[PDB]
Amino acid sequence: VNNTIVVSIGQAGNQIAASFWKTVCLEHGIDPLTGQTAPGVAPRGNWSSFFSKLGESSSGSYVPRAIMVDLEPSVIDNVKATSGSLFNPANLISRTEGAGGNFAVGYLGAGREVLPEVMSRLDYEIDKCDNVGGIIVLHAIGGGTGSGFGALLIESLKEKYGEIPVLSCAVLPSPVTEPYNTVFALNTLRRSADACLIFDNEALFDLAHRKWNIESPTVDDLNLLITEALAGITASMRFSGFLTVEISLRELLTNLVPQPSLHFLMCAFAPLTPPDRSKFEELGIEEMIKSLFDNGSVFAACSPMEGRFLSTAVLYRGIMEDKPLADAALAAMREKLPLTIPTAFKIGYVEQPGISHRKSMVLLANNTEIARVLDRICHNFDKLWQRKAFANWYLNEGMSEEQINVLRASAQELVQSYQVAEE
Amino acid sequence: VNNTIVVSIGQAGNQIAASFWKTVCLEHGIDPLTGQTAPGVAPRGNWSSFFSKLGESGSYVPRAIMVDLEPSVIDNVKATSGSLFNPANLISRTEGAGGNFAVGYLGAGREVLPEVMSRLDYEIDKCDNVGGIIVLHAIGGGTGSGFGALLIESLKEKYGEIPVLSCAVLPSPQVSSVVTEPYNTVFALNTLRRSADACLIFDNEALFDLAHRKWNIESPTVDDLNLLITEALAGITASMRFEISLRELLTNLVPQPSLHFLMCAFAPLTPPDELGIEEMIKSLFDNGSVFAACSPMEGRFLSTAVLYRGIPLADAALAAMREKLPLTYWIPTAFKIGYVEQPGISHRKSMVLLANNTEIARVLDRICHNFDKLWQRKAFANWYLNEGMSEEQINVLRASAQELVQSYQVAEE
Amino acid sequence: IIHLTDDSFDTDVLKADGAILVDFWAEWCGPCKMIAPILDEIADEYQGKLTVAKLNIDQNPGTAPKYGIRGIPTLLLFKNGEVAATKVGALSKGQLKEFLDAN
Amino acid sequence: IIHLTDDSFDTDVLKADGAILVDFWAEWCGPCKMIAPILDEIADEYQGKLTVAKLNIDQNPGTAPKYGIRGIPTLLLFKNGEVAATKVGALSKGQLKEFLDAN
Ligand SMILES: Nc1nc2c(ncn2[C@@H]2O[C@H](COP(=O)(O)OP(=O)(O)OP(=O)(O)O)[C@@H](O)[C@H]2O)c(=O)[nH]1
Ligand SMILES: Nc1nc2c(ncn2[C@@H]2O[C@H](COP(=O)(O)OP(=O)(O)OP(=O)(O)O)[C@@H](O)[C@H]2O)c(=O)[nH]1
């Protein structure tokens, strides 16, 4: 049974990480403030995939295979305040300065200083695994820690461990120096991550305002959407059962990534019903599947249907009221999708529902409209770089002017890859 | 404006409360994670009956106390409800009650009693006008039954003038195993009978069936059963949150102190996947709608309360129904109708039936008989005997339940 | 098939090296008899990996109350002197395995 | 979100360039409120391709009778000054799209 380690970097990363781990504890029946279970009981499911056991069953504990890194200490302090004795205190690493929204600080400056400690915690977590099946890196790329040190650590991870799958889950800024940091991070995510799942803050914002009626959505609201999707994607790895289709990170990325140069993914979730009504109001399978494949449901500001699908996985979990109907529906979708490069259409099923929906679905797709999201970013970068807006910020920090041109070109090489895949 | 405190006890009790409080927050427009309402504007209705306020333009705090002898449910509520609850009112110990009434009543539950009573003292004092305490608990285990019985008794000894409503979840018959549950249930029933002012039953067997047959879930989760309870509870309390006190409500439902057990029903019972009023009323009164495994129409009604919620002709069909009910003849009867503008977040319009009905006896006699199956061979006797209870004491309590059944049997002429 | 008393529990279960599954049971328990033939199969297929023990609660009333047993049959998994997991009630030979596989 | 009167219908709907969807509705209509949040999503996803308008039949009783409206909600698709298609009653956000896709 495969083990996964989740590394979270920076504000967004760690706040999402905290929400993810709380949800996963609740799914497995593990006390989210203490890592304990009721007297005599073991957690549900394949808990050892994401947790390790400490000591005897009496005073012992179930410990997230988690490492949290930041430069600014506020967010990790908050985790300590809200999460009791859940985490290994040695795995929550912070310093003192923030990176001040500067990618170069995280990659070359203060970031290089934190790396030996972070890498040493990775060593320890890795070795205490029966069989390590992947590492998930949770981060935003608009700031300077998640982007810079996220870039630094993925690179580092791949050099030292090589064969271990590394998936980035990366939050993108919504239309400051954010376009610069995004582009710089993208290079590493293109060259070194085995795959990168984007979470477009612009889309998340809209969904929270639109589908949920939140006039002024907060990051907590946006994190709910991400957490559901993360819980749902990881459910294949965290449960077993008579009907449960077990799927490793390895198997998943293999099916989602047809070439190393096309490894950027997007995702959609259903139901996007407001938490306000969550268990009282349910969608039937029809409306649910319909919604899953709707342009208004993707965690990306773009329209997958106007582009082409390179690959697709539908990850279902929970109650299955009518399997002939769901199969008929998915078969119909499979014949309706705009296609490229030969496609894959994978279907996963997990018996165990999440904690908020009786049944839910995550759609992961490798689709060419990701080019639109990426294009939006590059247009903003170019708008600032054409006039060298905050350029000295990065120049005085170790990057050279010509080398950032290389990274703007590197990202362009990735945007052209997906445009070529479409036509 | 009368105040109500909710004291939830044990696994079931606290899981239900957690969902009760989230819902009630939403109904009042209070954020269930912070206790705050949209800036400037106030919460809807008679909020102070269930919440109390902290600052100014400030936070609303539930009149809630949660108790368990095991930490994990109360820790789940803490993880998932932000700064809503008063930290001093969430009380837990470590080892559980091992499904044993006696630990809850004589052992470890006796040790948490003072802290709990202290928090009650504080919530009772800060009330301008205390209208009632509600106790949510399952009575199949050791904590909700043993500690639940201990707390009820303590509360009536010290406060006495305060009405106590027990909302008791009864255990469904186990076929995979032989369990201590019948003993615990009968032991708790004695207290519910002698000390509580009323007891509203929720039969796990009926709730499962309702989830399976009416909600269409192939195999219902505990979470499905709790949602059934939550919406009934949201409905019962609606009359107090938008006004009538718990005391006025129990006065009309209870004609003699020896006949204070209640059943409830809900409409619409449509799957989570809009009905005419006449058919809603018709459904509300059907045998297959009650949250107990019995048929109310085949017994007699001592008293009835219908509490309609949501969006004339409504008065005509309720009148028609009144005249079709088999009535207890010498005991005084009542048929109370209530209307509340604000709807449940679940349904644009809905109804709860609360009823004092003699068919409760078939539910109770099912419990008594499962007990006798165990007690005939002193099945788990030493579990209880080696924890402070005597053999004679078990018999006394068994006889007390038989007397409860007999009461309702007599009420049915 | 390992039978236990209250006197032998300490050595047989708690001082034991390796994992051990204890079946608290009785003759007058329908569901307990149901799994008696099931428990024999596991005693074969988990050789070295597990030892399977039985304690009859009538003739040994002292042990179950110490572990917070709510009824019978109750399967308890011990590793050192510690309860790893708990299964209450009669079950399939397949659900029993998935329970043993994960812990 | 475009609100209409009887006076503004001519210019806003009939003299309009490009396709337009009109929602004849009322406050006392259950099903009309049901699709109010749905219509907002289409106002986003069909930018340039469609404009979405609303006419409250109580405060503007003059227009619906001209188009043979049988009840509410009624969605009318206009292109020039002409009714392209008609949807009566509240519907899924998905059936609405398939309706918009084909016309
Ligand atoms: N979805 C979501 N986005 C967030 C969250 N927190 C911050 N963001 C977004 O993330 C981007 C900023 O990245 P941060 O993670 O906050 O910066 P950092 O690397 O952690 O910290 P510094 O380098 O010190 O600035 C912006 O686009 C924010 O809108 C969050 O909790 N959820
Ligand atoms: N309706 C409902 N029933 C429950 C729930 N949880 C447990 N039960 C039932 O309630 C009975 C057990 O009581 P609990 O409240 O769980 O346990 P407790 O007595 O309070 O605490 P302990 O004695 O330590 O075990 C069993 O018959 C279960 O079927 C719940 O969340 N909802």
Chain B residue at shortest CA distance from A79: B79
* Alpha carbon separation from A33 to A64, A68, A86 (Å, rounded): 12, 17, 6
CA gap A275, A280 in Å, rounded = 10
Q: Say yes or no: CB of residue B109 within 6 Å of ligand 2.
A: no
Report which of A239, A15, A45, A25 is spatially closest to residue B75, judged by C-alpha positions.
Answer: A25
CA gap A423, A371 in Å, rounded = 13
Contacts of residue A61, Cβ cutoff 8 Å, sequence gap at least 6: A34, A35, A36, A53, A54, A55, A85
- Ligand closest to CA B13: 2
Question: Using the beta-carbon criterion (under 8 Å), do C82 and A48 form an inter-chain contact?
Answer: no
The alpha carbon of residue A283 is apart from the nearest alpha carbon of chain B, in Å, by 6
Q: Whose CA is nearest to atom 27 of ligand 1?
A: A173
**Do B195 and B162 touch, CB atoms closer than 8 A?**
no
3-state class (DSSP) for residue A207: helix
CA gap A288, A323 in Å, rounded = 13
Fold of B360-413: Helix Hairpins (1.10.287)
Contacts of residue B125, Cβ cutoff 8 Å, sequence gap at least 6: none
Report which of B223, B250, B36, B18 is spatially closest to residue B133, judged by C-alpha positions.
Answer: B250
Fold of B263-359: 60s Ribosomal Protein L30; Chain: A; (3.30.1330)
Fold of A266-369: 60s Ribosomal Protein L30; Chain: A; (3.30.1330)
The pair of three-digit structure tokens given for residue D10, joined into one six-digit string: 């001519």
Task: Return the bridge partners of D83, or none.
Answer: D78
Q: Does the CB of C29 have a partner CB in chain A at under 8 Å?
A: no
Report which of A356, A199, A176, A375 is spatially closest to residue A277, judged by C-alpha positions.
Answer: A356
Chain A hits for B220, Cβ within 8 Å: none
Determine D/C contact with 3+ CB pairs under 8 A as the test: no
Q: Tally Cβ neighbours within 10 Å of residue B276.
A: 10
Which CATH code fits B1-262? 3.40.50.1440
CA gap B144, B9 in Å, rounded = 5
The residue assigned the tokens 């979730």 is A269
* Alpha carbon separation from D88 to A146, A230, A276, D33, D94 (Å, rounded): 51, 40, 29, 14, 15
Report which of A159, A165, A173 is spatially closest to residue A136, judged by C-alpha positions.
Answer: A165
Q: Does the CB of C90 have a partner CB in chain B at under 8 Å?
A: yes
**Domain-by-domain residue ranges, chain A?**
1-265, 266-369, 370-423
Question: Using the beta-carbon criterion (under 8 Å), do C102 and A46 form an inter-chain contact?
Answer: yes
Binding-site residues on chain A for chain D (CB distance < 8 A): 206, 210, 213, 287, 290-291, 294-296, 303
Q: Which amino acid is at A381?
A: F
Question: Using the beta-carbon criterion (under 8 Å), do A296 and D40 form an inter-chain contact?
Answer: no
Fold of A370-423: Helix Hairpins (1.10.287)
Chain B residue at shortest CA distance from A35: B72
3-state class (DSSP) for residue A53: strand
Position in ligand 1 atom list of the atom nearest CA A102: 23
> Alpha helices, DSSP H only, in A128-248?
145-161, 178-191, 201-210, 219-238
The alpha carbon of residue B190 is apart from the nearest alpha carbon of chain A, in Å, by 29
**Nearest Cβ partner of B178 from C31, C67, C68?**
C31
Position in ligand 1 atom list of the atom nearest CA A97: 24
The class level of CATH for A1-265 reads alpha beta
Q: Does the CB of B41 have a partner CB in chain A at under 8 Å?
A: no
* Alpha carbon separation from D76 to B364, D52, D62, D97 (Å, rounded): 61, 10, 16, 14
Q: Say yes or no: CB of residue B220 within 6 Å of ligand 2.
A: no
**Do A69 and A9 touch, CB atoms closer than 8 A?**
yes
**Do A100 and A143 touch, CB atoms closer than 8 A?**
no
Q: Whose CA is nearest to atom 7 of ligand 1?
A: A12
CA gap A378, A376 in Å, rounded = 6
Q: Does the CB of C67 have a partner CB in chain A at under 8 Å?
A: yes
Clarify whether D29 is annotated catalytic.
yes
Would strands B178-179 and B198-203 be described as parallel, antiparallel, or unpaired? unpaired
Backbone angles phi, psi at B92, to 5 degrees: -140, 155
CB contacts < 8 A, A to B, total 57
Question: Using the beta-carbon criterion (under 8 Å), do C70 and B377 form an inter-chain contact?
Answer: no
**Do A162 and A126 touch, CB atoms closer than 8 A?**
no
Binding residues of A for GDP, by number, are 11-12, 144-146, 178, 201, 223
Q: Is the dihedral of CA A193, A197, A199, A203 positive or negative?
A: positive
Q: Whose CA is nearest to atom 12 of ligand 1?
A: A143
Question: Using the beta-carbon criterion (under 8 Å), do C102 and A40 form an inter-chain contact?
Answer: no
Q: Does the CB of C102 have a partner CB in chain A at under 8 Å?
A: yes
Q: Say yes or no: CB of residue B204 within 6 Å of ligand 2.
A: yes
| CB neighbour burial string for B313-332, b if at least 16 within 10 angstroms, e if fewer | ebeebbeebeeebeebeeee
Chain A hits for C83, Cβ within 8 Å: 39-40, 57
**Nearest Cβ partner of D92 from A210, A287, A303?**
A287
The alpha carbon of residue A221 is apart from the nearest alpha carbon of chain D, in Å, by 19
Report which of A340, A357, A211, A363 is spatially closest to residue A293, judged by C-alpha positions.
Answer: A363
State the Cα torsion C45-C48-C50-C56 to the nearest 10°. Answer: 90
Report which of A245, A225, A246, A265 is spatially closest to residue A136, judged by C-alpha positions.
Answer: A265
Experimental method: X-ray
- Ligand closest to CA B208: 2
Tell me whether the CATH fold assigned to B1-262 matches the one assigned to B360-413: no
**Do C99 and C58 touch, CB atoms closer than 8 A?**
no
3-state class (DSSP) for residue C86: strand
What would the DSSP string read from start to end of B307-369? Answer: EEEE---HHHHHHHHHTTS-B-SSS---EEEEEESSPPSS-SEEEEEEEEETTHHHHHHHHHH
Contacts of residue A395, Cβ cutoff 8 Å, sequence gap at least 6: A401
Q: Is the dihedral of CA A348, A350, A356, A360 positive or negative?
A: positive
Position in ligand 2 atom list of the atom nearest CA B15: 31
**Do A150 and A106 touch, CB atoms closer than 8 A?**
yes
CB contacts < 8 A, A to C, total 31
Q: Which structural domains are found in chain C, ordered by start?
A: 1-103 (3.40.30.10)
Clarify whether A282 is annotated catalytic.
no
Chain D hits for A296, Cβ within 8 Å: 41, 44-45, 93
What would the DSSP string read from start to end of B257-273? Answer: TT--EEEEEEE------
Q: Which amino acid is at A412?
A: Q
- What DSSP character marks residue C15? S
Report which of A362, A316, A13 is spatially closest to residue A154, judged by C-alpha positions.
Answer: A13
| CB neighbour burial string for D61-91, b if at least 16 within 10 angstroms, e if fewer | eebbeeeebeebbbbbbbeeeeeeeebeebb
The pair of three-digit structure tokens given for residue A121, joined into one six-digit string: 């915690």
Report which of B259, B149, B143 is spatially closest to residue B197, judged by C-alpha positions.
Answer: B259
**Do A224 and A107 touch, CB atoms closer than 8 A?**
no
CB contacts < 8 A, A to D, total 20
Question: Which of D29, D36, D38, D88 is the catalytic position?
Answer: D29
Question: Which of A27, A72, A228, A251 is the catalytic position?
Answer: A251
Resolution reading in Å = 2.5
Q: Is the dihedral of CA B78, B81, B82, B83 positive or negative?
A: negative
**Do B147 and B67 touch, CB atoms closer than 8 A?**
yes
Determine D/A contact with 3+ CB pairs under 8 A as the test: yes
Question: Residue D65: is the preceding peptide bond cis (ω within 30°)?
Answer: no
Q: Say yes or no: CB of residue B138 within 6 Å of ligand 2.
A: yes
Q: Whose CA is nearest to atom 5 of ligand 2?
A: B12
Q: Tally Cβ neighbours within 10 Å of residue A250.
A: 15
The alpha carbon of residue D94 is apart from the nearest alpha carbon of chain A, in Å, by 7
- Ligand 1 mean position, distance from CA B120 (Å): 44
- Ligand 1 mean position, distance from CA A101 (Å): 9
**How far is Cα of residue A182 from the mean position of the Cα atoms in its chain?**
15
Contacts of residue A296, Cβ cutoff 8 Å, sequence gap at least 6: A207, A210, D41, D44, D45, D93
> Alpha helices, DSSP H only, in B29-170?
72-80, 101-105, 108-125, 148-158
- Ligand 2 mean position, distance from CA B255 (Å): 31
Position in ligand 2 atom list of the atom nearest CA B184: 19
Report which of A14, A64, A28, A16 is spatially closest to residue A355, judged by C-alpha positions.
Answer: A28
Q: Whose CA is nearest to atom 16 of ligand 1?
A: A11
**Do B253 and B356 touch, CB atoms closer than 8 A?**
yes
Question: Using the beta-carbon criterion (under 8 Å), do D92 and A290 form an inter-chain contact?
Answer: yes
Q: Tally Cβ neighbours within 10 Å of residue A334.
A: 15
Q: Residue D6 is inside which H or E element, if any?
A: helix D6-9
CA gap B194, B152 in Å, rounded = 10
**Do A204 and A233 touch, CB atoms closer than 8 A?**
no
**Nearest Cβ partner of A276 from B78, B271, B345?**
B345
Q: Does the CB of D92 have a partner CB in chain A at under 8 Å?
A: yes
